[PDB]
Amino acid sequence: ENSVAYSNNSIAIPTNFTISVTTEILPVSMTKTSVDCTMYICGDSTECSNLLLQYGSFCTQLNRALTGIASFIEDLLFNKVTLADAGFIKQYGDCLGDIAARDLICAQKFNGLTVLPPLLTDEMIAQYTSALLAGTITSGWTFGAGAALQIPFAMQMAYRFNGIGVTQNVLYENQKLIANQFNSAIGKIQDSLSSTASALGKLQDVVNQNAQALNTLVKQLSSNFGAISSVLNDILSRLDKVEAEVQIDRLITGRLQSLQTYVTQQLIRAAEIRASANLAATKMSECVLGQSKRVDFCGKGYHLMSFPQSAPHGVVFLHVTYVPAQEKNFTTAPAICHDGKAHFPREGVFVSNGTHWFVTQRNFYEPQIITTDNTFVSGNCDVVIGIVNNTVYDPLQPELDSFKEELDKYFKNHTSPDVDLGDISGINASVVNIQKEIDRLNEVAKNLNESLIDLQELGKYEQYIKWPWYIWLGFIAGLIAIVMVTIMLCC
Amino acid sequence: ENSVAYSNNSIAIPTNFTISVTTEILPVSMTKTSVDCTMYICGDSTECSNLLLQYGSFCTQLNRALTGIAVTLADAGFIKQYGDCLGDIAARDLICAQKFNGLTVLPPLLTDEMIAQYTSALLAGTITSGWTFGAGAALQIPFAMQMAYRFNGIGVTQNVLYENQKLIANQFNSAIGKIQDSLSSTASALGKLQDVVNQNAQALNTLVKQLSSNFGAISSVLNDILSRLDKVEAEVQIDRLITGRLQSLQTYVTQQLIRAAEIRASANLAATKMSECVLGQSKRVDFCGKGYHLMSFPQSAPHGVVFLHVTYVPAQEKNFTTAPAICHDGKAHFPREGVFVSNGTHWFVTQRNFYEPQIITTDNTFVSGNCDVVIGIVNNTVYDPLQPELDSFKEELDKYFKNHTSPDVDLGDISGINASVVNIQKEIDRLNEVAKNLNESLIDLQELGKYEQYIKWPWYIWLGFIAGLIAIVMVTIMLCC
Amino acid sequence: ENSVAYSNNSIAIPTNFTISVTTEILPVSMTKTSVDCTMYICGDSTECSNLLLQYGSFCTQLNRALTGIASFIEDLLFNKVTLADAGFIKQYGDCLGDIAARDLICAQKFNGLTVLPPLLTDEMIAQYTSALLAGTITSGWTFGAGAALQIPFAMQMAYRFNGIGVTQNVLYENQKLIANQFNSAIGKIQDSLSSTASALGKLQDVVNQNAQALNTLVKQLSSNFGAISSVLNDILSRLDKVEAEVQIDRLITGRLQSLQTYVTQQLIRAAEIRASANLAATKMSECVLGQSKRVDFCGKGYHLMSFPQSAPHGVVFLHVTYVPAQEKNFTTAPAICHDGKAHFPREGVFVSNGTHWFVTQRNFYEPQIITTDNTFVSGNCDVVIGIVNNTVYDPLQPELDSFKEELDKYFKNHTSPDVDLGDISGINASVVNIQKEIDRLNEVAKNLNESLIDLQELGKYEQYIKWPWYIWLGFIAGLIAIVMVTIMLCC
């Protein structure tokens, strides 16, 4: 049997003693300590302090836990007379030539009318008057047979009336046309001017109506942009505040964890103090009011007397004990197996003086003889095995899963799409250029002066006072006289 | 005297003992533990890791706690009335003479039948005169009357033509003056219209360009606001879970700290066991191993102390009738250091742990004055915490809550702007038609030829002129001598 | 020697005992308790409970901890006269005056002809006809000289034929001038009318184009402002929700701290209950079984017997002990120094009769004599000084920096700048006023064909008197004077 219960070992048994006085101090209570969370967490920060009021009454709940702890020639000579011929006077000129006696010989036949020019030179006037007078004179002499010379007087007069009427007829038709065209043209121009005037009025009304529409739109747009700008500024200021408070809230939460551990460690320490107060209670009853047989309880050594003494937050004991002065090792065995019967001492140890065995108290060397009423006897020599694991309570720690798995249960991952606004850069509002037309109108207005009729040029009775024949002789005679003198002048 | 102090009862008193060895393990210390809070809370998540940085140094504080643990043009057509009266008879020419302000007129047309009638009238007067006294010439009157009337008719017609020519020319000059005056007004109005419509067009282009930049600025700001809002909404969701997971970390630390407090208590017990059993012999019953103590041997452990207690335990025991005290003749007797035991007829004092009955004597027992008992209660209650007590969430929220609801943003409705359109197509079509139709108002005169006749000298003047040339020439020839 | 080990103080030793019974109650377990975190923090607020759902499964972890407890020459030479029609008529009237008989004496001469107006009143017709009739009648009687009174009949008509001839040509010339000027004016007016019509057509198209460009802009702007308002309303609604939820998250975090202390204090109480269960285990082991020598352990007084009992969550002991009935104080010393050597008892105290010294048990006054087997003797009288400072663990509380120092490490302070939209109030879109031009056009459209009041007479009365031949020979002789000067130069 090589068990620890029979094999002997050397232990030191005291032989001489000395007195010791042991001062033992045991806390029994702790000071009541509060904590203001505003100073602990924020302190001097005003932003933190304002946000902390929204966190509730956690401070008074934490303090509650801590509180409970405690051629060159003709032009020169003859006067020129122009006539408007309707188509017969030119042939009359070929008829006549110069001979005035052929005035009636060939009168032109115009569209069935025998016509003659209205012109009557002095040669013809004398000829016709002489014919008229000769007929009247000779009628009486010849019993009226000599009246036939009055016929050319009448025939020429009637023919000239036809010749005057023929050209007068076209003059009247021309004047009727000129008057009718002038009235019609003025009528058409009046229509155009009224049309232009009404068109301009319709243009002005629309241009001004669109001018008010643009002005109204611009004024309304400015109000809309003012309202949008003011709303945007408020949103940005609110957004800035929220983003600041969120970061501050993160630090407040993180510092709340440190405050929580500070409270927890204070509560745990109070529990340890309460256990120390329980120990001081037993020490007061077991050491002050009695004598303890337990070694090192009530001071190191073996108890004699103890004296309590108060402390500010604890209790102080002055244990009077006797401790060993000198000791020597002795060969001791817990039990000895004598022929299969284990013997062990009751209240003692088996000490050996080298040869025999003895029973002595554990705290003093005083060998005694082993007697029947000094030791117990066991039937067998075997031993009983027991195991005692004084384990402390193993806590059930949290079993958190992955952060992503916990987040995915209720997370709302959202992304706002970009604001898409219509593009108005394609609006043209083109311009107009009509300067060429305006220049044309101003040019025609200036040029319309040239179409004015000169009233001084209309009734123009042109007349040249040609030289009479008797001065032509004098001019010729004088011209000859003014050169014959030069004959003598040269020499 | 019915108390439990005097009534006897049966208990088991050991009679034989056997050696036992008890191995007792006592933790005295704990391994140092450090918690990685980023790994504990976030782990592999990156959004949590960046957000957890803003919570401060709580991880160091937790680790510190755990580390320490270890006279317105009309009226000239009197030919119409003359033609109607005449009836194409050629003899009523003189009878059908019209009038004009007392001037009898006849048209200047004389057909060959009329000419014969008037000439024969002229001829008849000349012949008949004389042969019928002087009264015969009266047939010459119609010849003179018709010619004089035709002279008046020509003079009247030429008068109305000149008057109408004067009227048309005078009217034309004044009409032209007015027209070119209205052309300047048309050109002036068009110049003013063009300037305004061009100025308005440039105003629209300027407004459109400015609006596009304003809408570009608004869109960029709104996109930035939306991006910031999406970040904030996601972050407040994440730090809700971080705050909730911080509670699990706190309980993890708290339970580690409480376990350390228990270990410290177990370290104190191991120190007590070492003093009272390794260095002494214990009189306590099962302190330091089951059964009564004999010897103990300490042994080191990785984080504790292992005790090899050698004790002796009862092997066989038999039940005995015992009483804590015995009331004899009014005085209670109780043993000092023992218990009363009964053999069946007598009483003895024996040790509580071994049956070795002894005779009751004065030195074995104590005597009390009376037989009453003293009643006491020891209520060893544990500390009852002052748990937090909170109000309702509703009445703790409205103390500082700010219930806000932004009113809907409204903007002025601009859909009422009209910008009406113009339609002057009727006037433009009229102007183009009149411009095209003014050609028909051109005057196409009936052309009259121009004949020019010289009034030549009469032959008798020509003869005289030649005679004058002859006379002057002969005088010059006389001077030439 | 002045220490407490030789103090000679006085203590009270029992001399008479009385049976006592002590009922000791020890808790050994806690009831199974769990916390409803949603009810604990929110209670009945739906907004809190919805937000608390996102805080994770902390409730399960907390309950896990709690559960585990339980014509380169003509111009140059001849005088030129050009009168008007009105002047000729006025001149003729000056001749005639009122006497309708001087028609022939001053008949005008024009361009070599003799002219008279083509008008005969009834007086002139009577005068000429009576002239013609007289010439015919008297011709026979007067023997030819009576026919002389017939020339004025012939002369008057020939004069009037010539006068008509020259006045028809001028009338045609007036028509030619009027027609030519009228046709030229019509062409110019045609050009201005087409130019006006084209200018109006360009203006109308541009005005209509601008109006359509404005309308499409207005329609697009309204849609853009509709999109802006809808996105702004959504942002505002999102902002209100975030700000409300931020405040609620603050109160939830604060209330989580108090719940954490509730769990912590429950866990600490369990540790104390487990400690009390250990004490009950030793009490059952040392009082119920076996007799304890520890005073006041296993009930007040000195242990006799104990009887266990069952409790709902604990154990009840019925400790039978004997307590001191009466006791008298006694003068005693822990040890008496004799002959320089300390004397202390073996498991007792040194009581004194007042004259001698005795050894007695601490719990009973039964004095005995002092022998070598009743006491110990030390070598010297000195005492050993020892101190046992039973300090409880001092936790390492958190050491936080200032809030500002911790916040500035990762703070992202940022204020969004104010928005500044462009100003569009400077757009005028001016209006037009052409009412004067429209009024002038509409007036001319009415006054164009109005008849004049002061028609101006046609023609002119200019006279171009040229040099007579009197100075023409003088001019020729002046050339001869140049000739004779050259002759004088030669000679």
Ligand SMILES: *[C@@H]1O[C@H](CO)[C@@H](O[C@@H]2O[C@H](CO)[C@@H](O[C@H]3O[C@H](CO)[C@@H](O)[C@H](O[C@H]4O[C@H](CO)[C@@H](O)[C@H](O)[C@@H]4O)[C@@H]3O)[C@H](O)[C@H]2NC(C)=O)[C@H](O)[C@H]1NC(C)=O
């Ligand atoms: C007195 O009782 C105490 C309380 O039970 C015992 O402490 C326990 O010891 C065991 C064994 O070491 C330990 O179990 C775990 O220990 C390790 C923790 O991770 C781990 O390695 C262990 O796994 C082992 O066992 C399994 C099962 O076969 C094998 O698959 C593995 O390969 C490995 O071998 C095991 O999980 C306890 O944790 C520990 N308790 C505490 C609270 O720490 C004492 O050992 C006991 N003493 C005696 C002398 O009996």
Ligand SMILES: *[C@@H]1O[C@H](CO)[C@@H](O[C@@H]2O[C@H](CO)[C@@H](O[C@H]3O[C@H](CO)[C@@H](O)[C@H](O[C@H]4O[C@H](CO)[C@@H](O)[C@H](O)[C@@H]4O)[C@@H]3O)[C@H](O)[C@H]2NC(C)=O)[C@H](O)[C@H]1NC(C)=O
């Ligand atoms: C519980 O234990 C009690 C204490 O031991 C017993 O009482 C004792 O019993 C013994 C034995 O009978 C007795 O001893 C003597 O009794 C007589 C004198 O008192 C005397 O006559 C006896 O002598 C007889 O027995 C011996 C034994 O060998 C013989 O030699 C003699 O020849 C003779 O036969 C004996 O010496 C005690 O006196 C007695 N005590 C008292 C106080 O009376 C109880 O009996 C016991 N109970 C039970 C139920 O066993």
Ligand SMILES: *[C@@H]1O[C@H](CO)[C@@H](O[C@@H]2O[C@H](CO)[C@@H](O[C@H]3O[C@H](CO)[C@@H](O)[C@H](O[C@H]4O[C@H](CO)[C@@H](O)[C@H](O)[C@@H]4O)[C@@H]3O)[C@H](O)[C@H]2NC(C)=O)[C@H](O)[C@H]1NC(C)=O
């Ligand atoms: C040892 O100390 C323990 C801790 O103090 C005591 O337990 C206490 O027991 C009392 C009752 O005796 C109990 O008080 C409350 O218990 C209930 C919880 O609210 C409640 O029902 C009780 O109501 C009482 O009063 C009303 C009206 O008067 C009666 O109708 C009830 O019947 C009842 O009497 C009372 O409010 C403590 O809570 C409880 N404490 C603990 C921690 O459990 C032991 O009683 C004490 N033992 C001895 C022997 O002294």
Ligand SMILES: *[C@@H]1O[C@H](CO)[C@@H](O[C@@H]2O[C@H](CO)[C@@H](O[C@H]3O[C@H](CO)[C@@H](O)[C@H](O[C@H]4O[C@H](CO)[C@@H](O)[C@H](O)[C@@H]4O)[C@@H]3O)[C@H](O)[C@H]2NC(C)=O)[C@H](O)[C@H]1NC(C)=O
């Ligand atoms: C504290 O205890 C001390 C130790 O007991 C006491 O000392 C003892 O005192 C007694 C009483 O006097 C004494 O007993 C004997 O003393 C004498 C022999 O030494 C002897 O003469 C005495 O006999 C006397 O008294 C009896 C009784 O009346 C008479 O019959 C005699 O005739 C005679 O008068 C007596 O037998 C002890 O010897 C003595 N011890 C020592 C060591 O001296 C203290 O007195 C005591 N103190 C107090 C204050 O009580």
Ligand SMILES: *[C@@H]1O[C@H](CO)[C@@H](O[C@@H]2O[C@H](CO)[C@@H](O[C@H]3O[C@H](CO)[C@@H](O)[C@H](O[C@H]4O[C@H](CO)[C@@H](O)[C@H](O)[C@@H]4O)[C@@H]3O)[C@H](O)[C@H]2NC(C)=O)[C@H](O)[C@H]1NC(C)=O
């Ligand atoms: C048993 O152990 C206890 C725990 O260690 C001891 O109490 C400790 O005592 C010290 C010393 O006083 C104390 O430290 C601080 O105490 C004061 C804090 O309020 C402070 O005044 C002290 O300042 C001291 O030291 C500085 C620098 O060294 C000097 O300038 C001062 O003049 C002064 O000397 C010091 O900071 C511990 O706080 C205190 N602990 C506890 C838990 O109370 C007991 O003294 C000890 N008992 C014995 C008998 O040894």
Ligand SMILES: *[C@@H]1O[C@H](CO)[C@@H](O[C@@H]2O[C@H](CO)[C@@H](O[C@H]3O[C@H](CO)[C@@H](O)[C@H](O)[C@@H]3O)[C@H](O)[C@H]2NC(C)=O)[C@H](O)[C@H]1NC(C)=O
């Ligand atoms: C919320 O949804 C977000 C949607 O944009 C998402 O951000 C983006 O996530 C994708 C997918 O993980 C990332 O894409 C990158 O990763 C893939 C995976 O291998 C690779 O092909 C490339 O690396 C690719 O770039 C985006 O980078 C990421 N965007 C940003 C800005 O990080 C968020 O992850 C979602 N949030 C949560 C909490 O789940």
Ligand SMILES: *[C@@H]1O[C@H](CO)[C@@H](O[C@@H]2O[C@H](CO)[C@@H](O[C@H]3O[C@H](CO)[C@@H](O)[C@H](O)[C@@H]3O)[C@H](O)[C@H]2NC(C)=O)[C@H](O)[C@H]1NC(C)=O
């Ligand atoms: C403070 O903010 C609260 C959150 O927006 C807001 O809650 C709203 O409360 C009203 C009633 O006060 C609810 O209206 C409901 O009323 C009854 C409830 O039984 C129903 O019959 C109605 O149909 C209606 O649902 C709102 O629904 C509720 N709003 C939300 C978003 O939940 C409070 O009103 C705010 N306080 C003030 C003074 O305005």
Ligand SMILES: *[C@@H]1O[C@H](CO)[C@@H](O[C@@H]2O[C@H](CO)[C@@H](O[C@H]3O[C@H](CO)[C@@H](O)[C@H](O)[C@@H]3O)[C@H](O)[C@H]2NC(C)=O)[C@H](O)[C@H]1NC(C)=O
């Ligand atoms: C984030 O930055 C902010 C500026 O962008 C800052 O707000 C400004 O803080 C300064 C002081 O740092 C204030 O200055 C004022 O100081 C005292 C306190 O009122 C006054 O007596 C002075 O006259 C002076 O005005 C600014 O007024 C203040 N600006 C605003 C708009 O409030 C924040 O403090 C910064 N936040 C953090 C958490 O650091």
Ligand SMILES: *[C@@H]1O[C@H](CO)[C@@H](O[C@@H]2O[C@H](CO)[C@@H](O)[C@H](O)[C@H]2NC(C)=O)[C@H](O)[C@H]1NC(C)=O
């Ligand atoms: C057309 O001719 C008239 C005259 O008949 C011009 O009128 C003259 O205008 C000038 C300035 O241009 C003035 O100094 C004169 O006094 C005006 N004269 C008269 C008589 O009124 C007229 O200007 C001409 N038209 C244009 C467009 O120039």
Ligand SMILES: *[C@@H]1O[C@H](CO)[C@@H](O[C@@H]2O[C@H](CO)[C@@H](O)[C@H](O)[C@H]2NC(C)=O)[C@H](O)[C@H]1NC(C)=O
């Ligand atoms: C004395 O002797 C034995 C023990 O030695 C007792 O037997 C016990 O009886 C109780 C009755 O409740 C049982 O629960 C135990 O299991 C028994 N123990 C054994 C070891 O068998 C017996 O009851 C006692 N006799 C008297 C009269 O008290």
Ligand SMILES: *[C@@H]1O[C@H](CO)[C@@H](O[C@@H]2O[C@H](CO)[C@@H](O)[C@H](O)[C@H]2NC(C)=O)[C@H](O)[C@H]1NC(C)=O
């Ligand atoms: C008036 O008549 C002239 C002469 O015919 C027209 O001139 C013609 O105009 C047409 C249409 O523009 C052209 O195709 C011809 O080539 C032109 N001919 C000549 C000879 O110029 C003139 O347009 C007419 N005015 C109108 C229609 O308003």
Ligand SMILES: *[C@@H]1O[C@H](CO)[C@@H](O[C@@H]2O[C@H](CO)[C@@H](O)[C@H](O)[C@H]2NC(C)=O)[C@H](O)[C@H]1NC(C)=O
């Ligand atoms: C003498 O013993 C008596 C008891 O028998 C003690 O008397 C009591 O002492 C306590 C503690 O000081 C006081 O509170 C009581 O008031 C005392 N009782 C009486 C009735 O006075 C006494 O203290 C002891 N003497 C000494 C010196 O300790």
Ligand SMILES: *[C@@H]1O[C@H](CO)[C@@H](O[C@@H]2O[C@H](CO)[C@@H](O)[C@H](O)[C@H]2NC(C)=O)[C@H](O)[C@H]1NC(C)=O
């Ligand atoms: C000048 O022209 C005007 C144009 O308004 C003529 O006035 C109109 O003439 C028409 C002829 O049919 C009448 O029916 C209208 O009643 C007249 N008045 C208006 C206001 O339109 C006017 O008659 C013309 N004058 C001349 C002399 O021809």
Ligand SMILES: *[C@@H]1O[C@H](CO)[C@@H](O)[C@H](O)[C@H]1NC(C)=O
């Ligand atoms: C052990 O039991 C036996 C049974 O016969 C008995 O005789 C003996 O006395 C007992 N031993 C002790 C030490 O009591």
Ligand SMILES: *[C@@H]1O[C@H](CO)[C@@H](O)[C@H](O)[C@H]1NC(C)=O
């Ligand atoms: C508007 O009028 C202001 C003066 O009032 C001028 O300076 C500016 O150019 C004008 N703008 C437009 C677009 O007409």
Ligand SMILES: *[C@@H]1O[C@H](CO)[C@@H](O)[C@H](O)[C@H]1NC(C)=O
């Ligand atoms: C106890 O008091 C009684 C009287 O009540 C007395 O006779 C007795 O002696 C006292 N006890 C002791 C041990 O002195």
